[PDB]
Design an enzyme around this catalytic site. Structure first.
Site, PDB file in Angstrom:
ATOM      1  N   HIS A  11     -22.099 -16.391  -0.376  1.00 55.18           N
ATOM      2  CA  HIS A  11     -23.319 -16.410  -1.610  1.00 55.18           C
ATOM      3  C   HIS A  11     -24.451 -15.886  -1.515  1.00 55.18           C
ATOM      4  O   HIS A  11     -25.118 -15.721  -0.208  1.00 55.18           O
ATOM      5  CB  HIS A  11     -23.416 -18.005  -1.544  1.00 55.18           C
ATOM      6  CG  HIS A  11     -24.103 -18.352  -2.959  1.00 55.18           C
ATOM      7  ND1 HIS A  11     -23.390 -18.634  -4.089  1.00 55.18           N
ATOM      8  CD2 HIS A  11     -25.373 -18.624  -3.305  1.00 55.18           C
ATOM      9  CE1 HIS A  11     -24.363 -18.675  -5.080  1.00 55.18           C
ATOM     10  NE2 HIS A  11     -25.516 -18.660  -4.654  1.00 55.18           N
TER      11      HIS A  11
ATOM     12  N   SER B 161     -26.108 -16.893  -9.050  1.00 55.98           N
ATOM     13  CA  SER B 161     -26.151 -18.078  -8.652  1.00 55.98           C
ATOM     14  C   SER B 161     -26.831 -19.263  -9.596  1.00 55.98           C
ATOM     15  O   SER B 161     -26.166 -19.390 -10.692  1.00 55.98           O
ATOM     16  CB  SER B 161     -27.316 -18.429  -7.408  1.00 55.98           C
ATOM     17  OG  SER B 161     -27.081 -19.350  -6.620  1.00 55.98           O
TER      18      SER B 161
ATOM     19  N   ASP C 295     -18.007 -18.422  -0.055  1.00 52.46           N
ATOM     20  CA  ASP C 295     -19.055 -19.040  -0.813  1.00 52.46           C
ATOM     21  C   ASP C 295     -18.591 -20.595  -1.240  1.00 52.46           C
ATOM     22  O   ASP C 295     -17.496 -20.656  -1.693  1.00 52.46           O
ATOM     23  CB  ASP C 295     -19.184 -18.263  -2.270  1.00 52.46           C
ATOM     24  CG  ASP C 295     -20.409 -18.589  -2.947  1.00 52.46           C
ATOM     25  OD1 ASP C 295     -20.780 -20.014  -2.874  1.00 52.46           O
ATOM     26  OD2 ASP C 295     -21.046 -18.002  -3.876  1.00 52.46           O
TER      27      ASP C 295
END
Lengths: 283, 283
Positions: free
Chosen positions: B253, B130, B223
């Site tokens: 995600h 991320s 995501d």
């Protein structure tokens, strides 16, 4: 070129792919319901007991064979550290559907019933690519019906349905190695009639998928079969089966066979090895 | 819910996760250009020498830390069989951009120059998830600029660009854990001004990506960051860098952080472990 010429060409092309050393190789004959089924047994370099992957080569039900798939089966064996058994199922047009399915299932049942021969104490999985992935999927469905308890199924860009509708079919149906025209032609060689399109043994998406073994499903971005493979994953999930569905981007149908020069293919074989070592060995 | 609060709930949930045993763990403090940087060094159960993975946790530049990521970094260490160094880079809003980046690159530079303390003969890689995948990608770009030769970069659903345009942003921007409102709020906490939107250290897609280390880029089907992560992979490829870009389907995600419950997360860690074993050890 004739079908015979192309079958030979597959074997010829294989001789340009390095064959990894494994522990031990032996060719067996599996007594089938309709035929005697040649298989090649690959042992890994590690000590047993083992899990056993029964592997079905791709080639549109018409092409491929133990020899042309020998480099891939060696690489898979070393990656999964498991016994791999590559099955020479009957090919079309000489042997129409459902011959390939009958052989693939007969071979699995025998391997399941004889796993002690291979020191196969950690259980049995199925796997295959393209048409082989179709056979692996169908073999897993037929197993459930016979209370054969499989550990896992590895479905490498599988064919799971007759398809005239997916976006990937039209986006990817030309210019990426496997074309519409190939798909049509393979289908004509393999199938007996239009009614076979209703048969789950040809289109396993049709079947009731609950209680099937957990799955790894690999699809390829530029593959006409991509969407239908991911649909098969979805339906499995909807049916309460665990599945890791992974789309390898930037690659075509068949990419795992070209592992020596498509690095993503090597990495896919690495992932296959991981999931099988996990399920068999807790590794 | 305040910053200190939402940090704490993250910490607390992660506290309940069973931790995998590793070889040995050492906490160290790296002398950064702007701060003393805490890092935790995880040794695998195998014996050296090792490759070293420098890892940057996610959490939107605002949350996460060494402790909360401790279960994942243990899992990664055992999967890659490599020394993993989890970096405690400065968080926002207390420390704005480019603090996280400065710390990440200072840590990587120090590890690289000190690879002997870890028996790291097989070289150094960067990875992160991320916001941490952002940091890893940016660290690799900065490395190239200073002639630091990394082996590999592992980018797990990275943030690579300010985005108002990708289809996945709009399709996946609500209902899937990481929302538009989150993305907005994190960027607000992290950045100093609109001018920072021109900075490749925030949006590494802007950088010249030639001669960067080969990459594994993992994206997630559901995501908002999916399309931009696949763009980064494509831009690397266009720039002559080898990359295996893999979209994990049916997941959201952050899914790798939930590996104990989301089997696809565990399989992602397997893949990460494979690619790093391959590049470090030629396995």
């Amino acid at each position: 070129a004739s079908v015979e010429e192309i079958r030979s060409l597959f074997k010829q092309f294989s001789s340009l792919t390095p064959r990894e050393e494994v522990g031990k190789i032996e060719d067996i004959t599996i007594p089938g319901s309709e035929t005697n089924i040649k298989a090649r047994v690959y042992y890994p370099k590690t000590q047993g007991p083992y899990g056993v992957l029964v592997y079905y080569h791709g080639g549109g039900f018409v092409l491929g064979d133990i020899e042309s798939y020998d480099p891939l089966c060696r690489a898979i064996t070393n990656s999964c550290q498991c016994v791999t058994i590559s099955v020479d199922y009957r090919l079309a047009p000489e042997n129409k559907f459902p011959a390939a399915v009958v052989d693939s299932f007969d071979a699995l049942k025998w391997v399941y019933n004889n796993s002690e021969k291979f020191n196969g104490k950690y259980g049995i999985a199925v796997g295959g690519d393209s048409a082989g992935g179709n056979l692996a999927a169908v073999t897993a469905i037929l197993s459930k019906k016979e209370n054969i308890k499989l550990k896992y199924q590895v479905l490498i860009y599988p064919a799971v349905s007759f398809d005239l509708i997916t976006k990937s079919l039209y986006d990817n149906g030309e210019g990426f190695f496997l074309t519409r025209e190939h798909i049509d032609w393979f289908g004509q060689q393999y199938l007996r009639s239009f009614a076979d399109l209703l048969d789950f043994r040809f289109s396993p998406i049709l079947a009731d998928l609950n209680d099937l073994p957990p799955a790894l499903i690999i699809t390829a971005e530029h593959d006409p079969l991509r969407d239908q493979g991911e649909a098969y994953a979805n339906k499995l999930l909807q049916s309460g089966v665990q599945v890791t569905s992974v789309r390898f981007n930037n690659v075509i149908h068949g990419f795992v066979s070209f592992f020596p020069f498509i690095e993503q293919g090597r990495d896919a074989i690495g992932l296959i090895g991981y999931v099988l070592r996990k399920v068999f060995y807790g590794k």
